[PDB]
């Protein structure tokens, strides 16, 4: 019953909007990248259902 | 000199160990590295057993960048090759 919807389904489509209208996201994001050092990724889609606000891998880490 | 891999005279022979001792990515080698071609047939049946790991995708794409160049170079051959000569065939080659 969910077959057709999941085909076209993608969570990453939300990225271009959240990159604009969320200052809480960027300002701490600035700190993660510029100043300190980790293998940060950014918005990473959790099995096409969520997009984690900030994450680190392969350690399966989340900063929501 | 009872050396198996030792190129350096100074070093010693790295000895075997249990397979669990090594990183996981050796396990992805023993499995049959599929083409992207059979891999779709797997997805046609949704065989949960055989499915590619993540690194497989890069190698499948490099089959696919390289297969596109195989056709473009074939079509030139099929159209410009003198009838005296022979084409390579695209089927199996049963010997004996």
């Amino acid at each position: 019953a969910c077959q057709d919807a999941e085909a076209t389904w993608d969570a990453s489509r939300q990225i271009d909007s959240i990159m604009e209208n969320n200052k809480e996201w960027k300002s701490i994001g600035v700190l993660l990248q510029n100043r300190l050092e980790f293998n940060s990724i950014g918005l990473d889609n959790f099995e096409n259902l969520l997009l984690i606000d900030w994450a680190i891998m392969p350690q399966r880490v989340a900063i929501m | 000199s009872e050396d198996v891999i030792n190129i350096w005279k100074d070093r010693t022979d790295p000895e075997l160990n249990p397979i669990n001792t090594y990183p996981i990515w050796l396990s992805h080698l023993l499995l049959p590295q599929l083409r992207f071609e059979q891999v779709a047939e797997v997805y046609m049946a949704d065989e949960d057993l055989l499915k590619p790991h993540n690194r497989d995708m890069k190698r499948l794409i490099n089959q696919i960048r390289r297969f596109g160049i195989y056709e473009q170079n074939y079509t030139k051959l099929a159209k410009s090759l003198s009838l005296d000569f022979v084409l390579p065939a695209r089927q199996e080659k049963d010997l004996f």
Binding site: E6 | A45, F96
Partner: protein, 237 residues
């Protein structure tokens, strides 16, 4: 590849989207080979007259059309544009899909049977079709399309499926009829291949086989080889 390896190692986990997607299409197609899409197609056109000769049309880039009818039905012959005709091919579904023709308020179902092209000149001569009516038998071509199965044990290793027939001719008596046929050959083997009667037993009630076209139900489609090593060891020894 398109990104350096050093960055890909950080993002090796990302590629699940790649493989999780290909689950969806190739499974969807593999199960949707059988079904006609539920979408109406229409072809505006005009009647035939004795005035409109071929070569007159063919400078105007129209085309003749021909329909063969069925029991008790009269034939119909029409005029249409070429670019309509090729667009009708250009669907997936061309072998069987139901196409209508609107002359005026009237509509005439049809199917594709074939087209003739003038081979030395390579322009469209005519576009031939076959009538379809609901309450009466109607010739259609049901292609056979075999799925892969990693559930059988002989199919997986060193054996080869052999599709001796591409499709089946039948007679349909109802509105919606199946596009094609799909088979799961697990229970098959070298010992028994599939035969047409194994299909005749499994069809809807509105369908029947056109015995006038086929030879015998005991005819067989899918055949399976033996093992290769059991040959190869014997070949060398």
């Amino acid at each position: 590849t398109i990104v350096g390896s050093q960055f890909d190692a950080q993002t090796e986990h990302v590629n699940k989207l790649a493989l999780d997607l290909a689950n969806k299409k190739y499974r969807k197609m593999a199960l949707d080979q059988a079904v006609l899409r539920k979408e109406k197609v229409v072809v505006p056109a005009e009647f035939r007259t004795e005035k409109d000769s071929l070569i007159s049309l063919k400078k105007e880039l129209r085309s003749p059309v021909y329909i063969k009818g069925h029991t008790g039905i009269p034939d119909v012959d029409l005029i249409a544009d070429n670019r309509q005709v090729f667009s009708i091919r250009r669907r997936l579904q061309f072998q069987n899909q139901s196409f209508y023709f609107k002359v005026g308020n009237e509509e005439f179902r049809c199917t594709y049977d074939h087209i003739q092209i003038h081979p030395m000149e390579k322009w469209l001569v005519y576009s031939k079709y076959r009538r379809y009516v609901v309450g009466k038998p109607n010739s259609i071509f049901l292609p056979i399309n075999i799925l892969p199965t990693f559930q059988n044990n002989a199919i997986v290793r060193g054996s080869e499926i052999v599709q001796l027939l591409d499709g089946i001719w039948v007679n349909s008596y109802n509105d919606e009829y199946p596009h094609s046929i799909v088979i799961d050959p697990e229970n098959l083997s070298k010992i028994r291949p599939l035969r047409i009667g194994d299909i005749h037993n499994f069809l809807p009630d509105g369908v029947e086989i056109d015995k006038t076209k086929c030879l015998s139900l005991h005819q067989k489609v899918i055949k399976i080889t033996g093992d290769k090593e059991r040959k190869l060891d014997i070949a060398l020894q």
